[PDB]
Ligand binder design. Structure first.
Ligand SMILES: NC(=O)C1=CN([C@@H]2O[C@H](COP(=O)(O)OP(=O)(O)OC[C@H]3O[C@@H](n4cnc5c(N)ncnc54)[C@H](OP(=O)(O)O)[C@@H]3O)[C@@H](O)[C@H]2O)C=CC1
Ligand code: SF4
Ligand code: SF4
Ligand code: SF4
Ligand code: SF4
Ligand SMILES: [Zn+2]
Lengths: 155, 56, 145, 291, 206, 43, 114, 38, 178, 144, 360, 95
């Protein structure tokens, strides 16, 4: 059969995809620090095939930690159009979601979503490293569900 | 814990100090959760006399 | 006032009244100030909101069940500094620091008295008066309140 | 109208404009800029998708926190398209493709599917049914891609009369199928193409106007270039099927009476002006005819 | 008495007498040395005599204040010279601090101190970014904190909180473009300023 | 009864100062070992 | 009113100090557009520039003018270098946002905007 | 040194505030009312 | 008390007893071994990793996380529209428009949090004079949309209608304690 | 011996999970073969093993079961599960699990925990829960 | 090949915090100071409270002062661990980083149990401290602190006699003493060049008066003698802890006055006056007197201090934060003169760019 | 256990459902409307009245440190009863 198998393929295409993904963890803020505590032993990233520091231009995902000013934004989006185009996005922090504090300020963007798409939003002012680590898994089943060839067969 | 009484001598020879007693992480005999409920102390000026706001 | 209420015995209570739909009554917190009953008797001419009883047992209000629905009855809300009696329409719709107060003028009678308007997020919640010494004096009538 | 369709609000991006709409094919080239000129000014644009959720991320933005929603469907299913537009002041139809598949042809896509969207829209109390056929498409054209499309222009009116129709001329924009075609490899083929936003603004401008309640428009633009002068001009600037290549040499028109742009609220941008940005991805003035 | 941050009366006189020491030695351009109950010194002066008091305080044995800490700019948009510009220093040798503040309009520039204290290379510049107060003789004045296309001077009390622009990505041009300001929640200015002065003998009669 | 958390009188000492234990031999037993083992090759 | 002057005297000495700045911006439209790519060719960039100096001609005070030169030099000092990007230099134009009706009649079909 | 001038003392160029919030923006100066509740 | 971190340079008459010991600290490398053999210890130690979804880490009952509107043990929504759980909310995150309940009583028609605001600071759980709002141990409530975090009130009850089995035991160990 | 004592101890680790299916399941499921004393086994299958000897972050581990409310929880395993009585035991907030000191019924709590629905249906959508705050007009259908 | 002139572009994270406080009261603005030195939270709050407490004229009680010092030099331990290791990452050493960030996560839990959450602990308020700390906390610091003087010297075994460290680090960024003061480093970056100074002993404010500790001066100004200062300052918390641990007095928290601290939650609920203050503290607030201060505190960075400025309204009037790094970074382009790239990385780490201070 | 619109949508504590002619219902398409079935007004009448002795008393919400600040009531109304604005309880005098 064809359609049955391509479904069984897409479960494999999106497996190598997710089982080893290469982020571009930004700093910018307090929110940055928890990823390092998530790079730490306790809630380790590397146990999932997630690499600690990968270059941007070979990245597979973005992780936005922190506030996002009106100054940094071009320096941000310039990166997003330098990843490849499976690029998924993760917005840690109440300051990147909608600018938790400093929603109302002027040198600040009222959400990373104002500039780039988002495959997952994550709450917390300091989102606990674990509190991300479920979200990163939520990303890791946001695409285990999505099917590229299953619909291309119908194209 | 499960340190087989050799690697301890490998660790210490490879590192130095006897460090099974001052190990990295914690197992036991610490923070036995749900300590009893405390009756706090009170501050001063719960004294009902010679207690105005002028002298504070 | 001080920080601590050394009172530890037990408070009292008071019955709630049924004046009318304009004016709620919480007379468990009335403080026997007489700042209302001297309004009706010297600014509106009614003489009904007497003081009943003595001691803490005293309680302001009619001895009987009567409705104080006359002009200027709503000014009694601005007067009672306690929130004992207050306006039923602005019962709980808002809270004052949340207001963005705009100062403006009465209409609907040809007096053209002055007003403080209370907004909340581009809406309206209260009508309140300003102090001009010539127009009304300090207050307004219940219609435009 | 009701209470919250009202266009009370200045500017855009948190405003409202009562342009609650359903653009269908906005997943590739054209509709994304449509949603951009809608979603910026404040307009609850629905987007029905039937493709990957990753192929629609770049639509998540240009949408101000609620004004952009998404949902699933498929054109070979009655009443899903109805479900998509139960709440629709407006409908837009950008659907189309430059090649037949095993499943869909030129015939099925431009004609049969708008026919149901047309009937679907009228079964609700909709107002506008902006459709996009293409210019150069009366009938009997040398290809088949266009001779089918005109039937939809016939078959809509017999379903939902008083429907805007835009039959524009050729489109150019970044990430197109037209200029990038030439870039990545002839007289009697002359063509006045039209910048994208100059199409998009009018559509966004056409979904609010009192007029345009059935009038067939055709967005063409200035600078009726000649191909051989233009194709080398691309080469001068930068340095596949039957029914598409057959559609290239068909391109020949002159405007008889049709409304166009400036009677809609648009200043058409020529080609030469915004032409480098699209050809900048291939790096290291052409002659016009009125006729 | 337990909860009153004990006054420690003595160092008031040190900073008071020393407060006099700087006046009579430097009566030009010096108005109302003072001191708060908090034993911390304040010296108001005229802008034409900025440096010669700094250099007395960077370079003099009895005022070794050779370390700068801040240079702010405080708004008072009701007087003429709305911008109170403040200095504040420190002795490593005498173990105390000072405060040397001045004034300016929106345009009465102040000659800089970078020959004296190079610590103020950037503290001076934010004031130019944040209030639009030019300084003479400052090397490479330019913006610090604001975008490279931000008009205004926002810490001014005239500039609203959420300013006059918000940025975003308009995909038709592939840029981080700006258009006017369009909120979703409308920061809600409260009237948390009650009656009842709370601080008599400390107030303003009409 | 009031017991928020005062400690018991004590909690002992704790090291605070560097206690790098010099392992590693003198240095004559480096060269004389090495060279004296190198020359084991050259025989 | 016996004010302190800064960088110049009564206006007509400050008007050449202006021209030192137009003398730079007029020669730094072509250098920017090439070094960092843009859409404008050269000219409407120069129209915009003079369209900013023909906004501040209403000034009549030397102190104000002696100040406005400076903020132009900063943006020049930010423009002459690559400290800006393609989004900052092309920000003045107000390309995208629709210009509102300057007349009355169309100005209130949307907006309570007196 | 000094210079003489008697002019209106405009600053409106040094703030941004492009066109709308300069001209078509009334301003109310007042002594706020006594909150008659208090 | 001031302590020289690095004051050992003294001409100790560097002889072949010791000056070559530095050359024994050099070409025959030992300090590098000393820095290497350390690391080799740890790979024979207990890695403190934990299999998160199957092994989650330690918290304490005062953990500031997701909000929830509690309820009395006899129905009766515990929130009463005081309007100081936004006046203190520094994020300015909240709008709690209210009315009578049609019972003559006093409750809300509105309650809100932008959880992308809401710094999770803890002012609201403690400012609430009733413990009507609290801030509970959920921290797996990441969603794919900025909109699904804008918790209105029905989520924020039925959330409070969920963890009330849990919060009433953490708070049971945190009353008489704040 | 020494070494062998580990293997006299490390072998029941494999042969302590019933059969091989019961063992091999756990392996790919969580990659944690550790013999654990059981205290739980909730509704819909959460077991909550325990062993005080390991360090402070592995003395309690839960093994989810398959067949949540129609989700097939073999592979797709969350932490938004673990309903509101073991969550407080698993994160080491307390010592006593909810079998000897369970929570207190209040006759309105849910009877079945719903996990963190990401983008499925059965999720949250915002409202404007304000009763429309205005009342406009109605024409009379009586011409003149 | 070689650097002569470098220029930073310090603006990429500004937010308008100094503006944004002007529209929020003191209690309503506290946690912004956790953000500035985002690594080391409490010490900011330790200062902000004092700038209030000076104006309000209150010493908080001892037990709250006492714990304010304890976390006030656990936060000292953080930033060193965050700029000893990150100064090793960007130089290259990635291991001690992970050896500590289990030792560091045992150092957040002692906020999580004490305060609400892990990191942005709104625990230190102007009126002392919000909330006492629990029973199973203080038997735990002993075990931790006992095992922690090892974890450092465990590392100092590895780096501080390491060629790859020493000649990557020594003679680098030679800071002249009298030039630092012209720039006003006033933190580690001057004591690391022999300027004997520490506010905690030269201008003591809290209960530091009886601690019997030491200041690790650095001579031979270079980023290895800064480094050794940064190490030994971690050690000489433990002398401070041991002395800040074994004599905690039983007492009160959240100062006796109900106008400057919220009252006991069981006490606002019967005693009327404690309810009203609870209703106005958390709406209006303190109602400070007008005035002004310039506080200070040596955080890991250095002289963190606040020029808080007040008015009779409950809200402040242009607070300002003294970011000690803000001056350290202005000296970036003078201390990197005659030095190449790779150490400029090290310069950043041994100026402790925890940007949030730098950014506003 | 809620009441429902003729369009078929769920009503809150408050009557809140959108009219038919409303584009807002889009957001519920291929989703569902979150709602709490636990109307307080239904639960609270399902609570018996506490018929106490003396005319004046204190109330609490089950734990004096644990809810409902100690307000009092005058229970002189034999016709109606007395409530406490925090809770929704009711009381009589027994005589
Ligand atoms: N772009 C051009 O050169 C010109 C285009 N046009 C017309 O403009 C319209 C836009 O086409 P354009 O957007 O340019 O090209 P696209 O490639 O972007 O195709 C437009 C959309 O049609 C959708 N679509 C096609 N067939 C089906 C189907 N059977 N069921 C559901 N969706 C379908 C596609 O979905 P998917 O995203 O999966 O492809 C795509 O999103 C078309 O009508 C085209 O004829 C007219 C003149 C010039
Ligand atoms: S959300 Fe909180 S922790 Fe994250 S950057 Fe903002 S203030 Fe810092
Ligand atoms: S004014 Fe108010 S408090 Fe005074 S007597 Fe009247 S009701 Fe009572
Ligand atoms: S959450 Fe608490 S403080 Fe806020 S309105 Fe409800 S009861 Fe009042
Ligand atoms: S936790 Fe703090 S920021 Fe979040 S809603 Fe409550 S008061 Fe606001
Ligand atoms: Zn009650």
């Amino acid at each position: 059969r064809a359609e049955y198998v391509v479904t069984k393929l897409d479960d494999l295409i999106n497996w190598a995809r997710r089982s080893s993904l290469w982020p571009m963890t930004f700093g910018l803020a307090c929110c940055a620090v928890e990823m390092m505590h998530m790079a730490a032993p306790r809630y380790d990233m590397d146990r999932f095939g997630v690499v600690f520091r990968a270059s941007p231009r070979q990245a597979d995902v973005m992780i936005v930690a922190g506030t996002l000013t009106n100054k940094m934004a071009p320096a941000l989006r310039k990166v997003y159009d330098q990843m490849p185009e499976p690029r998924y996005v993760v917005s840690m922090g109440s300051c990147a979601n909608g600018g938790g504090y400093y929603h109302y300020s002027y040198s600040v963007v009222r959400g990373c979503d104002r500039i780039v798409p988002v495959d997952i939003y994550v709450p917390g002012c300091p989102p606990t490293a674990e509190a991300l680590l479920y979200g990163i898994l939520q990303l890791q089943r946001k695409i285990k569900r999505e099917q590229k060839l299953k619909i291309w067969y119908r194209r | 814990a499960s340190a087989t009484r050799v690697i301890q001598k490998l660790r210490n020879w490879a590192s130095g100090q006897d460090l099974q007693a001052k190990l990295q992480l914690r197992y036991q005999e610490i923070a036995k959760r749900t300590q009893p409920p405390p009756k706090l102390p009170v501050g001063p000026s719960h004294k009902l006399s010679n207690n105005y706001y002028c002298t504070r | 006032g001080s920080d601590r209420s050394r009172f530890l015995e037990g408070k009292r209570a008071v019955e709630d009244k049924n004046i009318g739909p304009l004016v709620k009554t919480i007379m468990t917190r009335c403080i026997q100030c007489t700042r209302c009953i001297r309004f009706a008797s010297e600014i509106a001419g009614v003489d009904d909101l007497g003081t009943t009883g003595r001691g803490n047992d005293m309680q302001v209000g009619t001895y009987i069940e009567k409705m104080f629905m006359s002009e200027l009855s709503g000014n009694v809300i601005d007067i009672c500094p306690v929130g004992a009696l207050t306006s039923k329409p602005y019962a709980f719709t808002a809270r004052p620091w949340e207001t963005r107060k705009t100062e403006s003028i009465d209409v609907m009678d040809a007096v053209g008295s002055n007003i403080v308007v209370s907004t909340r997020t581009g809406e309206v919640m209260r009508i309140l008066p300003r102090m001009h010494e010539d127009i009304n004096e300090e207050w307004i009538s219940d219609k435009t309140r | 109208l009701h209470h919250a369709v009202i266009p009370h609000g200045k500017g855009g991006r948190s405003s409202v404009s009562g342009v609650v709409a359903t653009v269908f094919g906005a997943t590739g080239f054209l509709g994304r800029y449509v949603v951009n000129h809608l979603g910026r000014m404040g307009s609850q644009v629905i987007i029905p998708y039937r493709c990957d959720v990753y192929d629609i991320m770049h639509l998540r933005l240009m949408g101000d926190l609620g004004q952009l929603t998404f949902l699933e469907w498929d054109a070979r299913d009655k009443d899903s398209i109805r479900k998509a537009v139960q709440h629709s002041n407006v409908v837009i139809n950008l659907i189309g493709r430059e090649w037949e598949t095993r499943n869909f042809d030129f015939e099925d896509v431009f004609v049969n599917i708008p026919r149901a969207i047309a009937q679907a829209s009228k079964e609700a109390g909709v107002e506008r049914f902006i459709h996009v056929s293409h210019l150069n498409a009366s009938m009997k054209s040398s290809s088949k891609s266009l001779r089918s499309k005109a039937v939809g222009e016939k078959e809509v009116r017999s379903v939902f009369p008083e429907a805007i129709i835009i039959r524009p001329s050729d489109i150019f924009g970044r990430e197109d199928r037209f200029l990038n075609h030439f870039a990545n490899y002839g007289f009697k083929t002359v063509k006045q193409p039209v910048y994208v936003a100059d199409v998009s603004k009018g559509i966004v401008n056409a979904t609010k106007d009192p007029d345009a309640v059935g009038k067939t428009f055709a967005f063409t633009g200035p600078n009726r270039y000649l191909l051989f002068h233009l194709v080398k001009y691309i080469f001068g600037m930068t340095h596949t099927t039957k029914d598409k290549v057959e559609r290239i040499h068909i391109s020949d028109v002159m405007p008889t009476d049709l409304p166009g742009l400036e009677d809609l609220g648009v200043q058409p941008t020529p080609l030469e002006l915004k032409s480098i940005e699209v050809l900048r991805r291939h790096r290291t003035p052409a002659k016009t005819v009125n006729y | 008495r337990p909860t009153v941050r004990p006054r420690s009366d003595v160092t008031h006189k040190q900073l008071s007498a020393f407060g006099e020491y700087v006046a009579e030695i430097l009566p030009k351009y010096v108005q109302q040395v003072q001191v708060s109950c908090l034993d911390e010194l304040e010296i108001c002066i005229h802008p034409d005599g900025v440096i010669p008091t700094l250099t007395f305080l960077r370079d003099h044995t009895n005022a070794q204040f050779k370390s700068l800490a801040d240079l702010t700019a405080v708004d008072v948009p009701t007087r003429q010279n709305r911008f109170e510009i403040v200095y504040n220093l420190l002795s490593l040798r005498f173990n105390s601090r000072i405060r040397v503040k001045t004034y300016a309009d929106e345009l009465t520039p102040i000659d800089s101190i970078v020959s004296v204290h190079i610590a103020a290379n950037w503290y001076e510049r934010e004031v130019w970014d944040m209030f639009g107060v030019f300084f003479f003789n400052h090397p490479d004045l330019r913006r610090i904190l604001t975008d490279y296309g931000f008009e205004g001077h926002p810490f001014r009390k005239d500039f609203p909180l959420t300013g006059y622009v918000e940025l975003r990505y308009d995909d038709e041009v592939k840029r981080v473009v700006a258009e006017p300001v369009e909120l979703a929640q409308e920061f809600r200015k409260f009237d948390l300023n009650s009656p009842w002065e709370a601080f008599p003998a400390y107030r303003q009669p009409p | 009864v009031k017991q928020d958390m005062p400690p018991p009188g004590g909690y002992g000492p704790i090291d605070y100062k560097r206690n790098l234990p010099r392992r590693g031999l003198s240095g004559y037993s480096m060269f004389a070992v090495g060279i004296g083992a190198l020359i084991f090759g050259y025989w | 009113t016996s004010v302190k002057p800064i960088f110049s005297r009564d206006l007509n000495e400050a008007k050449r100090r202006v021209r030192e700045l137009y003398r730079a911006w007029y020669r730094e439209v072509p250098n920017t557009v090439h070094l960092m790519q843009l859409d404008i060719t050269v000219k409407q960039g120069r129209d915009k520039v003079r369209e900013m100096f023909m906004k501040n001609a209403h000034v009549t005070d030397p102190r104000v003018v002696d100040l406005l030169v400076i903020k132009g030099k900063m943006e020049l000092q930010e423009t002459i270098k690559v400290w800006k990007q393609r989004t900052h230099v092309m920000r003045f134009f107000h390309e995208t946002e629709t210009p509102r009706p300057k007349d009355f009649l169309s100005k209130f079909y949307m907006g309570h905007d007196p | 040194q000094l210079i003489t001038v008697d002019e209106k003392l405009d600053i409106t160029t040094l703030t941004g505030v492009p066109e709308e919030h300069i001209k078509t923006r009334k301003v109310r100066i007042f002594v706020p009312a006594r909150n008659n509740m208090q | 008390t001031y302590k020289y971190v690095n004051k050992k340079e003294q001409e100790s008459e560097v002889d072949m007893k010791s000056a070559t010991d530095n050359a024994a600290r050099i070409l025959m490398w030992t300090e590098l071994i000393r820095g290497l053999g350390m690391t080799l210890s740890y790979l024979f130690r207990e890695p403190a990793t934990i299999n998160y979804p199957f092994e989650k880490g330690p918290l304490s009952p005062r953990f500031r996380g997701e909000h929830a509107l509690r309820r009395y043990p006899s129905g009766e929504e515990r929130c009463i529209a005081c309007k100081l759980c936004e006046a203190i909310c520094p994020a300015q995150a909240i709008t709690i428009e209210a009315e009578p309940r049609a019972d003559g009583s006093r409750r809300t028609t509105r309650y809100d949090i932008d959880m992308t605001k809401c710094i999770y600071c803890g002012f609201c759980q403690e400012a609430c004079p009733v413990d009507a709002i609290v801030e509970g141990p959920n921290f797996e409530f990441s969603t794919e949309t900025h909109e699904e975090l804008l918790y209105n009130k029905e989520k924020l009850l039925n959330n409070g209608d969920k963890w009330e089995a849990e919060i009433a035991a953490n708070i049971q160990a945190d009353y008489l304690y704040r | 011996m020494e070494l062998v004592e580990v293997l006299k101890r490390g072998v029941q680790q494999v042969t302590g999970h019933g059969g091989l299916r019961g063992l091999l399941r756990v392996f790919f499921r969580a990659n944690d073969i550790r013999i654990g004393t059981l205290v739980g086994e909730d509704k819909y299958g959460n077991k909550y093993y325990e062993d005080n000897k390991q360090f402070f972050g592995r003395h309690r581990w839960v093994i989810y079961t398959t067949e949540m409310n129609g989700k097939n929880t073999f592979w797709d395993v969350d932490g938004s599960m673990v309903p509101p009585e073991w969550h407080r035991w698993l994160h080491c907030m307390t010592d006593d699990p909810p079998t000897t000191n369970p929570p207190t019924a209040r006759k309105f709590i849910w009877t079945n925990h719903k996990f963190n629905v990401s983008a499925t249906p059965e999720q949250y959508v915002p409202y404007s829960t304000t009763r429309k705050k205005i009342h406009e007009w109605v024409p009379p259908s009586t011409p003149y | 090949e070689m650097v002569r002139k470098c220029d930073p572009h310090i603006g990429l994270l500004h937010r308008g915090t100094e503006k944004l406080i002007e529209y929020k009261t003191y209690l309503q603005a506290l946690p912004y100071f956790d953000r500035l030195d985002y690594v080391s939270m409490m010490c900011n709050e330790q200062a902000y409270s004092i700038a209030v407490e000076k104006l309000l004229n209150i010493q908080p009680p001892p037990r709250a002062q006492w714990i304010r010092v304890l976390f006030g030099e656990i936060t000292r331990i953080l930033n060193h661990i965050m700029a000893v290791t990150t100064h090793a990452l960007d130089i290259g050493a990635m291991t001690p980083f992970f050896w500590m960030f289990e030792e560091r996560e045992k150092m957040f839990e002692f906020y999580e149990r004490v305060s609400g959450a892990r990191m942005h602990a709104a625990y230190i308020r102007p009126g002392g401290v919000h909330q006492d700390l629990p029973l199973g906390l203080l038997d735990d610091i002993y075990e931790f602190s006992k095992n922690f003087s090892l974890r450092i010297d465990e590392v100092e075994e590895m780096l501080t006699n390491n060629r790859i460290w020493r000649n990557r680090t020594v003679d680098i960024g030679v800071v002249t003493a009298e030039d630092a003061l012209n720039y006003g480093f006033s933190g580690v970056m001057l004591r690391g060049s022999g300027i004997q100074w520490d506010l905690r002993k030269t201008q003591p404010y809290d209960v530091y008066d009886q601690v019997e500790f030491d200041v690790p001066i650095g001579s031979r100004g270079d980023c290895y003698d800064r480094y050794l200062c940064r190490v030994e300052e971690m050690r000489q918390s433990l002398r401070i802890i041991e002395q800040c641990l074994n004599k905690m007095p039983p007492g009160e928290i959240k100062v006796d006055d109900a106008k400057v601290s919220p009252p006991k939650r069981a006490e606002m609920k019967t005693s009327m006056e404690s309810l009203i203050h609870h209703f106005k503290l958390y709406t209006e607030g303190y109602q400070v007197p007008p005035g002004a201060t310039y506080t200070a505190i040596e955080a890991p960075k250095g002289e963190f201090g606040v020029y808080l400025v007040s008015d009779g309204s409950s809200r402040p009037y242009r607070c300002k934060i003294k970011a000690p790094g803000f001056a350290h970074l202005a000296g970036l382009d003078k201390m990197s003169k005659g030095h190449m790239l790779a150490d400029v990385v090290a310069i950043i780490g041994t100026q402790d760019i925890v940007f949030g201070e730098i950014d506003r | 256990g809620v009441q429902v619109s003729p369009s078929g949508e769920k009503i809150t504590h408050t009557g809140q459902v959108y009219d038919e002619k409303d584009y807002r219902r889009v957001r519920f398409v291929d989703r569902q409307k979150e709602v709490n079935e636990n109307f307080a007004i239904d639960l609270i009448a399902q609570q018996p009245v506490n018929e106490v002795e003396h005319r004046i008393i204190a109330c609490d919400g089950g734990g004096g440190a644990l809810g409902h600040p100690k307000v009092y009531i005058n229970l002189d109304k034999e016709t109606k009863t007395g409530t406490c604005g925090y809770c929704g309880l009711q009381f009589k005098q027994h005589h």
